[PDB]
Amino acid sequence: DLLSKFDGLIAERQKLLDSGVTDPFAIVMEQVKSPTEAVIRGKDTILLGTYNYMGMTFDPDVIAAGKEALEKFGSGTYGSRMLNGTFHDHMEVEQALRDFYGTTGAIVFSTGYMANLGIISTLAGKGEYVILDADSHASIYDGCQQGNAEIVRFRHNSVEDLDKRLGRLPKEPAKLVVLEGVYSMLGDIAPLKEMVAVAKKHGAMVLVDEAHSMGFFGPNGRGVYEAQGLEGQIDFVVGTFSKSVGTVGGFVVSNHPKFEAVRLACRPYIFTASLPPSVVATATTSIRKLMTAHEKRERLWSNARALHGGLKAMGFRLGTETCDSAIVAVMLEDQEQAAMMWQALLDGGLYVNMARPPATPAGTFLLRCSICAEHTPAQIQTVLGMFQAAGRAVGVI
Amino acid sequence: DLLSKFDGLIAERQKLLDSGVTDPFAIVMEQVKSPTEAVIRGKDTILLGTYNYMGMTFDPDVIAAGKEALEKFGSGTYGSRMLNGTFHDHMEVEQALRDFYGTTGAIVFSTGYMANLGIISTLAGKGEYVILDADSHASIYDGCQQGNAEIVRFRHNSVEDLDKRLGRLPKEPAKLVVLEGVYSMLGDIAPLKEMVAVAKKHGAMVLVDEAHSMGFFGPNGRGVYEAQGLEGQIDFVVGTFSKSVGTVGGFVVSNHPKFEAVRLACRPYIFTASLPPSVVATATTSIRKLMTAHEKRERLWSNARALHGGLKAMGFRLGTETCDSAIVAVMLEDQEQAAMMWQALLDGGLYVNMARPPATPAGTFLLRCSICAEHTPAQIQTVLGMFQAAGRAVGVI
Ligand SMILES: Cc1ncc(COP(=O)(O)O)c(CN[C@@H](CO)C(=O)O)c1O
């Protein structure tokens, strides 16, 4: 039947369970003490696989904003933005985004996935081109799939290939080059400056996904593009509320004068319920605090450097040579090594993300650590001690 | 450039504004007094365009559940379900769905749109078939677009055409027939009994979208399918949290023994953040209350019948001959008539949904009323008085 095509995934999952590891896709934060600590499997566990980069989920202003919205506006909105839909807090979150990015335009979506699905499938139609980095987020690929544009992949972080690939395309059709500031797999940074210059040489518009930089890149927290001096040169910036902001939702911001017209054509914007009052109140409050969250940001980068530097010192192979983001990827030799390492850490009271094929390429097996501005120096050293103990026990280092 | 393709929509929107009507896609609930009353444009306005069928958004248990979750678990989850992701309240909402639908299987998504996008694109692959009603929700069409199955449309609520269309397909490939219990455009009901019997004759699996029936159809509130005696015959039921439940989120439930394997393949499930603790706590609490919400349900249907019956009595042409759902669609002769009627009601203190081409077919212009179990008989008569005053002032009736 229709589910028979899953027999292979069901077998592979059971074969992983046969190894004796905890089901990695069924971990439950039974209790959450803080942005960095939760009770998992009855054990107090340090969290190092969240993308809660700025620890805003327990910020007292954020929580109070959320509680106030539930009291004032209820548990939900009344369907689509384009119908009953739009509450006061939705107009506020959009303005919070404008103020944060210094843009005239801001369209919020009900998820980050849907923002990418939507903006990509809506901006580029038949006969037009979407040119994307080969390791773009799944939501970017799905957006290409939802659209009817021609899709053009280029080699990962290759300025050369972007240029050659763009150059071969016909000049007249409109083009969208899709980049990410920080790429989530290895925690590496795009050379946006060079890629944007290449994009503009060929007359292409540029979309940058800054989900993994919001709040802690650039002088205003706007992302890698702002860090690299590209203010006013990026046509569209996409992001999410689910990383630094600390809730759900997606968005695209832009200074294009027609940008608000996307609301009129964008199906994942039109045909879904708007976010609950509490979600947009917490996002609004968090976003605004993120404009001037210097202490958090400093601690985030201090934590990232300590984890990255310490893990490299012990002899772990990392995804990046230098500490370029709040993601640190530990690269392991085989899938078994990853699992035992992952289980060891979990059992010792640390949760990190495990990444394996097909999540990664066939020749790559990762443990992905995501640093939080609310990790303490003590926690970071405890994690280092834990990686040292696990790596040595498993024979990785 | 990429936005030039919107010039036509920008012109049409401005041409509507030239008429002198309020921008219908920018209405803001500045304040919300209750499920049925809000301050819009500085005026106390009755809400009749929400899909808040059961008035759960201000249920005290729902709100308290939401507040407790913000306090205990924070403003957000830690990314994808398949990673840090899953909190206690996510396991609870899924079980609440199982208990509500009497199913072993329940997969929650971050939106209803994404549940449809995801389940349809994931269940039917290359060489397989998706057979859908021609007026299926936009999210169902988009799911077909996201997949690589063959798409087969049949004439709206035509059991005959479904049968002929299915019959022509090759017998061996797996097939998904997609139906809705209540169709949102006219508020009409599908003949699921006959369509399911046809679907099963051709060996097809059936997906039913019961977004517009949850809580008030069937002896358990499960939807039109339960109302029509189809318990245990529907392979998958899709729904949303954004209508009766009173927040955001989507879901699919099923008794298929492999159903949980969809989590392993479903991209819009894998590659998006899980819902915030407050969202899943409010959904959980609402869903459970909806199992035994008889007073609300009785009032909902009593309200629907009064509005439907009263509007028909005055001489309005309605989408349905009898009161078949909580949606009442008033059919108008031309787009101007719809607008002036819509503006008149708004100005008199009533918001209803306006539907026009291309939202509707070229030969259809609708005002769509959605009834709420928390409307009072007094409000319903006030609305009737308002439709009477507007219709007569505009010359509709
Ligand atoms: C039958 C059906 N199935 C699925 C969905 C998607 O639900 P979501 O809005 O919760 O994503 C809707 C949405 N319907 C509303 C928005 O909530 C709309 O204006 O389109 C629907 O009507």
Ligand SMILES: Cc1ncc(COP(=O)(O)O)c(CN[C@@H](CO)C(=O)O)c1O
């Ligand atoms: C670069 C990028 N762009 C967009 C998204 C989508 O954001 P959403 O999870 O808020 O929908 C993600 C999600 N990333 C996480 C889930 O939040 C994941 O595990 O895939 C992302 O990494």
